[PDB]
Design a protein around this nucleic acid. Structure first.
Lengths: 246, 105, 90, 137, 73
RNA sequence: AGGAUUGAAAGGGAAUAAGAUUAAUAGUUCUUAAUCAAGAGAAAUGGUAACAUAUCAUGAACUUUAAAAUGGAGUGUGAAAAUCUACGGAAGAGUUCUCUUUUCUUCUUAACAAAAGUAAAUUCCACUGAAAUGAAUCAAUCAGAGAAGUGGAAUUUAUUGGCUUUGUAAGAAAUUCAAUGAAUUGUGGUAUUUUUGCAGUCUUCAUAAAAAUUAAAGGGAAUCUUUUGCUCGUAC
RNA sequence: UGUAAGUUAGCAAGAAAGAGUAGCUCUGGUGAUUAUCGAAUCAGAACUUUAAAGGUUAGGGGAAUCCGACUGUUUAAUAAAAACAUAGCAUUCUGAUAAAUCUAAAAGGUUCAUUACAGAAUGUGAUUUCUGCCCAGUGCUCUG
RNA sequence: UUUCACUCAUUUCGUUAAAUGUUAA
C-alpha cells in the first residue's frame, strides 16, 4: 500500500515545528566557578508568554562575573515569581522559591523543577505547566540523590545536578474543557502539524492497516509487538493490558 | 467628485503605501505619500513613554537639533524622572547601609 | 436576566449542560480580579495563561492558568518554608 | 532640624539630579513668589577626577578642578544626608541668600568660579571627601 | 520660501553679498519684495509706499530688477 | 570583533511638489519653488518641578536602553475631503405666453517652511490633603504608593506645530468679456459618508517577525558659500 | 397586540394569529447659546380619495418519524450525504543516550527553540442515563 | 569462565574549552 501518516511524519516536511515566534531556549545558565562555589544574583526583568508552551518564561538578567556586561538569561517561571525579584543561583543559595540550587543541598521532601538529568546540561525534567519533582533521599557515599519524577518513576541523579526550587507556573491548564474545534485549531498555532486526526478505520486498505471493508472495524488485534516494522505498528504497542482500568 | 490614481507603481494598500488625497488648483485632486505613525522612547525600567521627545522615524532624530533628541537630566533619554529618583535613592541608601552594617559596625 | 446560566449564556444551547457547567467555574475565576500580594489591591488581572499583572501597582506575577495562586502552588510554598527553617536551625 | 545650613543633601530631580549639595538657607514656608518650601544649595556640579604621578603639575591642577552650582531647590526634591560641612571653611557659601537669586537671569559667573576655587582648593587638601566623591547611580 | 518680518532684516539682506536677483510685485493692497538668494526666496510684504521707495533705493544698481504687475513677464 | 552565499518591484527603507508641454514620455522634460547624502572653504545656561534653549555650549574604547517593530473586535470622538445645507453675492447658461425675485455651472491651490489667533485627547509637575467619601464615562475607571480644585510641562492629531491664517501665490489655474488685454475668487452648520489619528473596554490552552540603519545614555580617553550624485526599468 | 407543546432552562420564536400603513392641512414631545439658532425622529387629530408596504426589493406555515449533536469538510467533470472532521470519553508505550520515525551511509534528519499538564500510537464521537457475562481460540504481556 | 576496581580507546553531553585536582594563604 501507501506510506502511513506516521511514516510521513519523520521526514521533516510540513510536519516541522512551527517555531518562528518562540522566545528561545529556556534553561539554566552555563555552569562555572561562581555557580559551583558561590552564588550569582539574577533580576527578573519581565515575565513573558512563549508561544507553543503552557508556562510563562522569565527574562532574567544576570551580571557577567568575569567580564563587563550582562548575561541575559531565559528561565522557566516558577509559580510566585514577580517582576523585580532577585533570584540567586549557586551552591550556597538560600532555599527559597525561584532559587537555583544543586539537588544535593535540597532537604529531603523539597519540591523542585527544571532538574538536570546530567550535571551541567541545563534542565531536563519537570518542565511542563504545574509540574514538579520531589527529592526522595540523599546518598553521600556515591554523591547521588533520588528524585521522584512527575510520571511517578524514581530516578537517581548526581548530587551536583542543579534545579529550581518550586512549581512551574501555569498549573491547571488542561482542566479547562476545549469546547470548539476552532479552539483546538488555535492550540497548535506554535506546534507541529497533527490536529485533525482521521480514524484509520475510515481510511482505505492501502493507506492504513486498519483500512476496512464493508463494515468499519479493525479485524485483527490492535495490540502489537514492539518489534513490528514502521508501517504496521499502528494501535497499542507492547500493551501489557487493555480495557478500562479498575 | 474627482477620482484619483496611484502615482507610484505600488498598487496595494500596504502600510508603506499610505496616500492622502488633497485638493489643488482648478478643483483637481492630487495624491500625497503620507508617513507611518511611529512610537517614542520608553523608560528602560518601567516602560513608560518619555516626555519631551517627538515620535518620528529613527533617521529623522539625526536631523533634529542636538537638544531636541534628549532631556537634560541624569540618563536623560532612557529613564523617566521617576525611574531616576529610584536609582539615586537606591545608590545612596544601600551604600549608607553597607557603611553602617559592615565596615566598622 | 437569566435563571442559572450566568456567564455561559454566550455558548447558547450547543455544548452540553455538563460541559457548560464545568467551563463556567473556570471562566468566572479566570476573569475575576485578585488581591495583589505586594500592595493589597483588587487590581490583578490575567494577561496570558499563567501571567498576572497588578493594574494599579506595576508588578507582573507568575501564577496558575486561571487563578492567581493554585492550591498545589500554595502548599508547596508553605512546605519549602518549613524545610528552610528546619535547615537553617540545626 | 533636618534641613539646616551646612547640611549635605543629594538632589533628586532636575538638571542637577544626583549632584551633592550643601544647604545654605532654609525656608519651609515659602515666600510670596516661591509657593514651595525651598532651600538654596551650593554643590559640586562636576566632580574632580583622579590623578596619578605621571602627569605634569598643570594637568593635576585642571584635573582636580571642581565646577560648582548654586540653585534654589524645593525641599521635596533634595534628600538630606548625615554629613555636614563647616560653613566657616566654606565661607563663600554663607553669602548665598535668597535675595541673590533672581528669576530667569543667569547666576553671576564670577561668584560661581569663586566658590569653585574654594571647593577646589579645599578638596586639594583632602579635608572633605564624601562631598567631592561622585555618586554612582 | 521664507518671509522677512520687519524692515531691518531686508536691508541687511540687501547689503549682504549673497543676493542674486530682486523681483518687485505690486498687488492691489500691498507690495512684495521677493529677494532671490542662493538658497531661499525671501519676501517682505509692504503696504506703505514711502517705505517701498526707501526699499527701491536700497537695491544695488548692478542687480537685475524685475517689475511684475497684472501681466506676468 | 564574531560568523559564509542567495532569498520580497506587496515586509524594512535618506531625500519633490504645483502648473505647462508631445501625434506618443513624464512624481523622469520645461518654468518656478524645495529636500537628502558624501565631501570642501578642564569644556554653556534657564526652570521648585515636569522640562526649555536660529549648530552651539568637546566627548574615544567599552556596556546598556529605545526606535525600525507588530493580533483582532466593538464603542466614543478630534481633524480633513466628498455630498447636503444657511447668509451674501459676481459671471455665464436653460425655461418663459401659463407661472417661476426662477433652475443649472465656476468661485481653487502643492511640496517645503512660518507662527497673528485658537482646539480635542492622554500622561506627568508644584501647592493642598478627601469620609457626610468624592471625581467622572456611551461603557468604564480612579484615589493617603494621593483623588477633586488651581496653575503649569510634554506628546499625538496625513510637512514644519492639529485647525483657520501666512510665505510659495496669483504672476498659476477656473468662469466670463473684448479684439493680446480686462474683471471677480466672503463667512458659517449641535447634518450624512469616507479617510486618518486618539482614548480607554473586550478576547485568546492564539500573545500576534528579523536585520540593515539611527539616536540617547553610563564612562572619562585625547587636548553660510560651493562641488558631485554612476548602472538598470519606464511606451501600451 | 399576542405567542403553545417541548427543553440541556440558554431556546423554541420572526412560533402560530390579528390589526394598522396613502394624500393633504395641522398639533405636541425630545436641545444649544443666553429672545436667537438647529436635528431628524416619535406620537396624535380633522378632511379627501381609485381605502394606501408591494413599481423594485421582500419569510409560506403547522403535527410527527429516522440519521448526524452543533459551526465546518468532501469524490475538479453524474454521489454534498446519514459519509469525514469535531469537542467529549477511553486505552497503550516512553524519563529523553527515550518513544514514534525518514535515510544506502553518516560528528545525519523530524516531533524537539520540546521534557509526562509532554511526545507518539489508536477506538468511540456533544450533553443526560449506562456500559452487562466470557481469558477457552488468536493476539499482547509477565515484575516469572 | 563469572564477580569485581580503574581509564586509555568508545559513547552522550557544555561552554567565551573562563578557576578542574592538590598544596598554600
Amino acid at each position: 500500500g501507501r506510506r502511513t501518516l506516521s511514516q510521513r511524519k519523520g521526514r521533516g516536511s510540513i510536519f516541522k515545528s512551527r517555531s518562528h515566534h518562540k522566545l528561545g531556549v529556556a534553561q539554566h545558565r552555563a555552569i562555572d566557578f561562581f555557580e559551583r562555589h558561590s552564588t550569582v544574583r539574577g533580576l527578573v526583568k519581565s515575565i513573558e508568554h512563549d508561544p507553543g508552551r503552557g508556562a510563562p518564561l522569565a527574562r532574567v538578567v544576570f551580571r557577567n562575573p568575569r567580564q563587563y556586561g550582562l548575561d541575559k538569561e531565559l528561565f522557566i517561571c516558577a509559580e510566585g515569581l514577580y517582576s523585580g525579584q532577585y533570584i540567586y543561583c549557586g551552591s550556597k543559595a538560600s532555599l527559597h522559591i525561584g532559587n537555583v540550587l544543586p539537588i544535593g543541598q535540597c532537604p529531603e521532601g523539597t519540591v523542585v523543577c527544571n532538574v538536570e538529568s546530567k550535571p551541567g546540561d541545563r534542565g531536563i525534567i519537570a518542565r511542563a505547566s504545574g509540574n514538579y519533582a520531589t527529592v526522595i533521599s540523599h546518598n553521600a557515599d556515591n554523591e547521588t540523590t533520588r528524585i521522584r519524577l512527575p510520571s511517578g518513576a524514581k530516578k537517581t541523579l548526581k548530587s551536583n545536578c542543579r534545579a529550581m526550587v518550586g512549581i512551574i507556573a501555569g498549573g491547571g491548564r488542561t482542566e479547562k474543557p476545549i469546547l470548539k474545534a476552532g479552539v483546538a485549531y488555535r492550540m497548535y498555532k506554535a506546534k507541529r502539524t497533527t490536529w485533525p486526526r482521521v480514524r484509520g478505520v475510515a481510511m482505505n486498505p492501502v493507506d492504513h492497516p486498519h483500512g476496512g471493508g464493508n463494515h468499519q472495524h479493525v479485524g485483527h488485534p490492535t495490540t502489537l509487538k514492539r518489534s513490528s516494522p514502521p508501517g504496521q505498528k499502528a494501535g497499542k504497542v507492547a500493551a501489557r493490558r487493555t480495557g478500562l482500568i479498575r | 467628485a474627482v477620482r484619483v490614481t496611484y502615482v507610484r507603481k505600488h498598487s496595494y494598500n500596504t502600510k508603506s503605501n499610505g496616500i492622502r488625497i488633497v485638493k489643488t488648483a482648478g478643483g483637481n485632486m492630487t495624491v500625497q505619500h503620507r508617513q507611518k505613525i511611529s512610537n517614542g522612547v520608553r523608560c528602560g525600567d518601567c516602560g513608560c513613554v518619555l516626555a519631551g521627545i517627538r515620535h518620528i522615524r529613527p533617521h529623522q532624530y539625526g536631523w533634529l537639533g542636538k537638544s531636541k533628541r534628549t532631556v537634560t537630566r541624569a540618563y536623560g533619554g532612557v529613564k523617566c524622572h521617576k525611574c531616576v529618583q529610584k536609582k539615586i535613592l537606591r545608590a545612596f541608601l544601600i551604600n549608607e547601609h553597607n557603611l553602617i552594617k559592615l565596615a566598622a559596625a | 436576566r437569566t435563571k442559572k446560566v450566568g456567564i455561559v449564556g454566550k455558548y447558547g444551547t450547543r455544548y452540553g449542560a455538563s460541559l457548560r457547567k464545568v467551563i463556567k467555574k473556570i471562566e468566572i475565576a479566570q476573569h475575576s480580579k485578585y488581591v495583589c500580594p505586594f500592595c493589597c489591591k483588587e487590581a490583578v488581572r490575567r494577561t496570558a495563561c499563567g501571567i498576572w499583572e497588578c493594574k494599579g501597582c506595576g508588578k507582573q506575577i507568575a501564577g496558575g492558568a486561571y487563578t492567581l495562586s493554585t492550591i498545589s502552588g500554595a502548599t508547596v510554598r508553605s512546605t519549602v518554608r518549613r524545610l528552610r527553617d528546619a535547615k537553617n536551625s540545626q | 532640624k533636618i534641613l539646616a545650613p551646612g547640611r549635605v543633601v543629594i538632589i533628586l530631580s532636575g538638571r542637577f539630579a544626583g549632584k551633592k549639595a550643601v544647604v545654605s538657607s532654609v525656608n519651609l514656608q515659602g515666600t510670596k513668589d516661591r509657593k514651595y518650601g525651598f532651600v538654596t544649595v551650593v554643590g559640586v556640579e562636576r566632580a574632580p577626577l583622579k590623578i596619578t604621578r605621571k602627569m605634569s603639575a598643570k594637568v593635576q591642577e585642571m584635573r582636580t578642578s571642581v565646577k560648582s552650582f548654586c540653585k534654589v531647590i524645593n525641599v521635596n526634591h533634595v534628600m538630606p544626608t548625615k554629613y555636614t560641612v563647616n560653613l566657616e571653611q566654606f565661607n563663600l557659601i554663607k553669602q548665598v541668600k535668597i535675595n541673590n537669586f533672581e528669576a530667569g537671569k543667569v547666576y553671576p559667573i564670577s561668584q560661581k568660579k569663586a566658590i569653585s576655587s574654594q571647593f577646589a582648593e579645599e578638596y586639594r587638601k583632602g579635608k572633605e571627601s564624601w562631598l567631592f566623591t561622585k555618586l554612582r547611580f | 520660501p521664507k518671509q522677512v518680518q520687519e524692515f531691518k532684516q531686508i536691508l541687511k539682506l540687501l547689503k549682504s553679498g549673497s543676493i542674486r536677483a530682486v523681483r518687485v510685485k505690486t498687488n492691489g493692497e500691498n507690495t512684495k519684495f521677493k529677494v532671490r538668494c542662493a538658497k531661499y526666496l525671501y519676501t517682505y510684504i509692504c503696504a506703505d509706499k514711502a517705505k517701498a521707495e526707501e526699499l527701491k533705493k536700497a537695491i544695488p544698481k548692478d542687480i537685475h530688477v524685475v517689475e511684475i504687475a497684472k501681466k506676468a513677464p
